[PDB]
Structure 1
Amino acid sequence: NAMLYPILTQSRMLIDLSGTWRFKLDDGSGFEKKWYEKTLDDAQLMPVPSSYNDIKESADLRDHYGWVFYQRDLNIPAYLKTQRIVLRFAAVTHSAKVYVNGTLLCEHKGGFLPFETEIPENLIRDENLLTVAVDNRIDHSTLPVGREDESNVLSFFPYTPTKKQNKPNFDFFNYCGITRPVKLYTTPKDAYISDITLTSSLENNTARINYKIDTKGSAHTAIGVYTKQGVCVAQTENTGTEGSLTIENAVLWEPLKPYLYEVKISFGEDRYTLPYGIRSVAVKGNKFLINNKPFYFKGYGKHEDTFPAGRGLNMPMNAKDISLMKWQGANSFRTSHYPYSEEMMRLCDEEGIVVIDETTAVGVHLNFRVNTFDPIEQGGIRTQSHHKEVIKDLIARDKNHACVVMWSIANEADTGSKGAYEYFKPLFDLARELDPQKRPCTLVSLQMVNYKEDCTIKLSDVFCLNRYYGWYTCGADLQAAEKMCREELEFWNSLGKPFMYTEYGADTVMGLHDTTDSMFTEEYQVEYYKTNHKVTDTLDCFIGEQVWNFADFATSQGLIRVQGNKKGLFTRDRKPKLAAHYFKERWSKIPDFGYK
């Protein structure tokens, strides 16, 4: 469960296994014929990390259904065997089977969170083959959810598909493969650090770090806290597993003004250094408080999506995206609709970007007659069990990030229907139990005629609304959109708790224009946002605006998707639309703290 980010330390090797791997589509016989026991024959080459769907020009590759096999050679020095040898997969989408030589080492379900496995030393021969089989199939038991009929979420006349294909119950393309880096790392065999938990206490004008260090084996523990320049500001040797350290002259991590201490931990020979921002988060009344100050979210729902790697880790684009958000005056984004790479989370900690951290739970809705949360034995959704593992794993991975201020339990589940509360109650209970910082929890609310029956009202600390007044309703009638927006949002405002837009927007094709309200035009995108803001700016409990979307991104094919989703403020190659300049202006006049 514990998943420390792998780093090069005095006690820990870090070997990146990324590069060109061999790649072979499964044809139904791949496991029967035990392809993982030899070199892949008649194979292609595929970059790792990357989604595989867009690297070639093959529609059958892009739209492949089922398994693929990745493989590479792994010839490592024998003196590594004096250490504990670990294979870390930061993400394999959606499910993986990992083989070393002929031998199945592990299997994983869930395409967006890391997993790892020791390599037993009796298995390492002189030359080794690493094989990773990757399953892309989605159904009523996976997160994200796939449809199990021939229905498309986006048809006039019915037809029989040529081949079976995944049918996403979500509005983004089903990019799969070895999405994020594969690495080999080592620790001391006999005594090593397995996890680190840090929390902050700011009471009585005294900043303290509380630590809890999880180990394997028997040794002595030490912890030191260091400034960015390397001055030790607190340290203790031969400590317990738990304790606290006072940080005199503590500098707080603040949105757009990050400060990270370096927390170095020793256990026997093992050494691990964890960056850590000191800050508090709390919901009080109708305010979202960061370091006891009333925060206003300004930003976006995002996607991990770039050409040609798809969902694949793209670190230059990560840095470019954060630079664009600072240029635009944003302070935050949400990990729509899955955990993002640790490289992104760590960069956000470094750059002072606030993150709403979301699970993989999109598509938990069977009625976009069996109801979504009917009993499984009557056709209800089969995701609750995996939904708990995802929450456990997500919090275990990201718990120490200062940038994470809120957990989002699901995106647009069927939360107005019968049984939703009972499905979601244990998941909220679990997230509150597991997060040592006890951060606020929410689910992101689907737009819905019976919004007063949204079970978010009974569960969430912040109400997060996805609303499309002026796009999916009142299209090209913004005066009607304004009225419909005000009627519903005055209800939410009357509940006295913080609420916010986590999505709102309008599909906009760069280069289409009209001085007169016309859907898909750059001007309409601006007018859409002006209309919504006319309402939200008058509501004192509305504490944040995150647009849909930061940038255009790939989706499944359909009559309402113009080469993907076009609601980005930026294009897929990160060029500003008219509305992106509109937001730079607007967000320049709105402070991070004390707007409402």
Structure 2
Amino acid sequence: AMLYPILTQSRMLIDLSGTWRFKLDDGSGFEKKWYEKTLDDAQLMPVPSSYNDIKESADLRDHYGWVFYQRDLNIPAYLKTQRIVLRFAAVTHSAKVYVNGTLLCEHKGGFLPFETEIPENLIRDENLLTVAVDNRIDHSTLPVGREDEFPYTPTKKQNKPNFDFFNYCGITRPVKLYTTPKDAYISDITLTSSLENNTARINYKIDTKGSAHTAIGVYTKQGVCVAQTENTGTEGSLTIENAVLWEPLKPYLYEVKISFGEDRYTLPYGIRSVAVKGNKFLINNKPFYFKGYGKHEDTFPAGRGLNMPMNAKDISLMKWQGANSFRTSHYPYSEEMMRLCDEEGIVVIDETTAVGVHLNFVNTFDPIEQGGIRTQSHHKEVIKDLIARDKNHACVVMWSIANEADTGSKGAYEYFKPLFDLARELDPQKRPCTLVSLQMVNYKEDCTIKLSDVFCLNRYYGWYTCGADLQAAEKMCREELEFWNSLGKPFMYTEYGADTVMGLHDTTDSMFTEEYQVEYYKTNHKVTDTLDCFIGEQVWNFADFATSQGLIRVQGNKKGLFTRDRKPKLAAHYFKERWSKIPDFGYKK
């Protein structure tokens, strides 16, 4: 259970972000127990941020292994009357947390929150908070790193990402200290909704620790109570007359206030339905057409780090462009972004960290004993933790189980079936599930056909195939997409695009130019607009972003409609025009 920490009448919230001490591990940091004393000969690093781009050092940027963050933690003694909790919104990739040299908790997985109580007896008048952060990736991590997958011997050992984005690490999201009452407090809140005529019934389950009485109340934004049930135990339901539904680009959030003993917590909540029916993706019982992007959490210089002004700018640009949705490629995004999308009416496809589950791009899904991928156990944990964190978001309409796994190979169904079963069991709302499909010659053998509610395709007709032959791209696009269209279920693009360097131009089709980006998209839409079951277009990518170095990466990935500083390329204006003429609902009715 991971409720978003908020300031309430029962809960202090103390942000510990700021300037922290920082030291690269030199191979002796654990042996010499750096976490027991003030870090010596240390640099300074902003928190939250990725550490890789803050300085001008390639050794820092390309570091392999651990780093140590540290700050002083002098807290008011009267907080010891409360339960004191340290929340790490995200530490990428793995973390060990020490208070005063005592290991308090460890965590695997770089993009989901974790927390630990601080034992009263450990707190002294002056305290040290140390966080060791591991950046290493391999066949057991999500995201996956390669291990052995004019030759040269590298100077130093480096991570080998099995994914096309830079391995930004550090204390990515805020660190906060919060409190709750000691004796009785709210642990989790689960809400589902059903529309009966114009009355909405909200089914609640309120998980608590300790012995006390539970109450739930629902308030409009303006502050009018529209439902209240007291001494209700853990499970129950209530009704809202003439409920205002949450709609894409027309958000409405109620305030759900919960009290348990002395503990008080407020959850914003939008009421809406999601259902796949035939070849339709229904939101509030109307056929939606996704218009949007795969994104990244990527800005300069914080890398993956939480950037709230940019989050606000990005949503503003989305609304300027006529988009209604994006996918959290390829990892859960910050709770701050997810709460802003609820507030602004932006639909989200919520994706796990499972990118790179593919050893043949030895078989990927061979037994662990025989060298197959070792991620399934952590993959279940990521699904559990992601749904636990984001289950109550109206903006989340679909779960993406993995990006571009080896789903056309033997064993894939066996790997993914338990994960789809888990996602459907744990999501109280029973939202659609998908995996995002890699382009593949044997696409009719993609195990997504056996598992997903929506077929989400990543296709590069006109870039990675048929480059500079868009007439051939159109023909090959049509041949494959007519297959998917024949299955009768909703399908969409979750990626399609072309690397485009702003400032490069040609009137005559030429890859990497701004004009070719437009013609690439025009050619794809010639096909998709004719296909009844194609219910969404999400470009790759919203904006240019950083990747590992290589001969095909022109200083990162250039498939953005926007540059990294959010300036529109020609194709950004093209999509503003196109999306201005396509309705959010009823385009293909």
TM-score, scaled relative to structure 1: 0.98
Query: Aligned residue for 1:526?
Result: 518
What CA deviation, in whole Å up to 9, does each residue of 1:31-65 have, x standing for no partner? 00000000000000000000000000000000000
Which secondary structure does the structure 2 equivalent of 1:391 belong to?
Answer: helix
What CA deviation, in whole Å up to 9, does each residue of 1:51-95 have, x standing for no partner? 000000000000000000000000000000000000000000000
Structure-1 separation of matches of 2:229 and 2:545: 49
Shift in Å at residue 285 of structure 1? 0.3
Query: Aligned residue for 2:249?
Result: 256
Structure-1 separation of matches of 2:536 and 2:243: 28
What CA deviation, in whole Å up to 9, does each residue of 1:76-119 have, x standing for no partner? 00000000000000000000000000100000000000000000
1:309 paired to 2:308: no
Structure-1 separation of matches of 2:560 and 2:37: 45
What CA deviation, in whole Å up to 9, does each residue of 1:311-349 have, x standing for no partner? 000000000000000000000000000000000000000
Which secondary structure does the structure 2 equivalent of 1:519 belong to?
Answer: coil
What CA deviation, in whole Å up to 9, does each residue of 1:294-319 have, x standing for no partner? 00000000000000000000000000
1:500 paired to 2:499: no
What CA deviation, in whole Å up to 9, does each residue of 1:486-520 have, x standing for no partner? 00000000000000000000000000000000000
Structure-1 separation of matches of 2:481 and 2:198: 38
Structure-1 separation of matches of 2:366 and 2:101: 43
What CA deviation, in whole Å up to 9, does each residue of 1:142-170 have, x standing for no partner? 000000026xxxxxx10000000000000
Shift in Å at residue 204 of structure 1? 4.1
Structure-2 separation of matches of 1:537 and 1:593: 15
Structure-1 separation of matches of 2:2 and 2:355: 24
Structure-2 separation of matches of 1:360 and 1:20: 28
Contact 2:198 2:243 (8 Å CA) reproduced: no
Query: Aligned residue for 2:317?
Result: 324
What CA deviation, in whole Å up to 9, does each residue of 1:101-140 have, x standing for no partner? 0100000000000000000000000000000000000000
Shift in Å at residue 203 of structure 1? 3.0
Structure-2 separation of matches of 1:3 and 1:236: 24
Give the share of equivalent positions with the same residue, in percent.
100
Shift in Å at residue 241 of structure 1? 1.2
What CA deviation, in whole Å up to 9, does each residue of 1:446-504 have, x standing for no partner? 00000000000000000000000000000000000000000000000000000000000
Structure-2 separation of matches of 1:207 and 1:103: 49
Structure-1 separation of matches of 2:434 and 2:215: 37
Shift in Å at residue 564 of structure 1? 0.1
Structure-1 separation of matches of 2:472 and 2:204: 54
Shift in Å at residue 537 of structure 1? 0.1
Query: Aligned residue for 2:272?
Result: 279
Structure-2 separation of matches of 1:64 and 1:372: 28
Structure 2 residue aligned with 1:238, among 212, 231, 239? Answer: 231
Contact 2:352 2:401 (8 Å CA) reproduced: yes
Between 50-59 and 141-150, the greater mean CA deviation after superposition = 141-150
What CA deviation, in whole Å up to 9, does each residue of 1:336-395 have, x standing for no partner? 000000000000000000000000000000001x00000110000000000000000000
Shift in Å at residue 206 of structure 1? 2.4
Which secondary structure does the structure 2 equivalent of 1:15 belong to?
Answer: strand
Which secondary structure does the structure 2 equivalent of 1:393 belong to?
Answer: helix
Which secondary structure does the structure 1 equivalent of 2:488 belong to?
Answer: coil
Structure-1 separation of matches of 2:550 and 2:138: 20
The structure 1 segments of at least 4 consecutive aligned residues displaced by more than 2 Å after TM superposition are 203-206
Structure-2 separation of matches of 1:196 and 1:179: 26
What CA deviation, in whole Å up to 9, does each residue of 1:188-226 have, x standing for no partner? 000000000000011344211111100000011111100
TM-score, scaled relative to structure 2: 1.00
Shift in Å at residue 591 of structure 1? 0.2
Structure-1 separation of matches of 2:161 and 2:244: 45
1:299 paired to 2:298: no
Structure-1 separation of matches of 2:143 and 2:91: 14
Which secondary structure does the structure 1 equivalent of 2:120 belong to?
Answer: coil
Shift in Å at residue 236 of structure 1? 1.6
Structure-2 separation of matches of 1:94 and 1:135: 6
Structure 2 residue aligned with 1:553, among 545, 559, 562? Answer: 545
Structure 2 residue aligned with 1:381, among 373, 377, 395? Answer: 373
Structure-1 separation of matches of 2:198 and 2:327: 31
Structure-2 separation of matches of 1:443 and 1:238: 42
Query: Aligned residue for 1:118?
Result: 117
Structure-1 separation of matches of 2:144 and 2:234: 40
1:18 paired to 2:10: no
Query: Aligned residue for 2:464?
Result: 472
Structure-1 separation of matches of 2:555 and 2:586: 40
Structure-2 separation of matches of 1:484 and 1:401: 38
Shift in Å at residue 3 of structure 1? 0.1
Contact 2:198 2:241 (8 Å CA) reproduced: no
Shift in Å at residue 535 of structure 1? 0.1
Shift in Å at residue 240 of structure 1? 2.2
Query: Aligned residue for 1:141?
Result: 140
Shift in Å at residue 242 of structure 1? 1.1
Which secondary structure does the structure 2 equivalent of 1:485 belong to?
Answer: helix
Structure 2 residue aligned with 1:194, among 183, 187, 190? Answer: 187
Q: CA RMSD in A?
A: 0.5
Structure-2 separation of matches of 1:253 and 1:22: 44
Structure-1 separation of matches of 2:467 and 2:399: 32
Structure-1 separation of matches of 2:198 and 2:309: 40
Give the 5 Å matches for 1:6-155. 6-149=5-148
Contact 2:198 2:242 (8 Å CA) reproduced: no
**Contiguous gaps of at least 5 residues in structure 2:** none
Which secondary structure does the structure 2 equivalent of 1:431 belong to?
Answer: helix
Structure 1 residue aligned with 2:392, among 397, 400, 424? Answer: 400
Structure-2 separation of matches of 1:252 and 1:499: 26
Query: How many equivalent residue pairs?
Result: 588
What CA deviation, in whole Å up to 9, does each residue of 1:165-193 have, x standing for no partner? 00000000000000000000000000000
Shift in Å at residue 592 of structure 1? 0.2
Which secondary structure does the structure 2 equivalent of 1:407 belong to?
Answer: strand
Structure-2 separation of matches of 1:537 and 1:175: 38
Structure-2 separation of matches of 1:481 and 1:535: 10
Shift in Å at residue 239 of structure 1? 1.4
Contact 2:199 2:242 (8 Å CA) reproduced: no
Structure-2 separation of matches of 1:426 and 1:480: 39
Which secondary structure does the structure 1 equivalent of 2:536 belong to?
Answer: strand
Contact 2:49 2:305 (8 Å CA) reproduced: yes
Structure-1 separation of matches of 2:169 and 2:93: 6
Which secondary structure does the structure 2 equivalent of 1:238 belong to?
Answer: coil
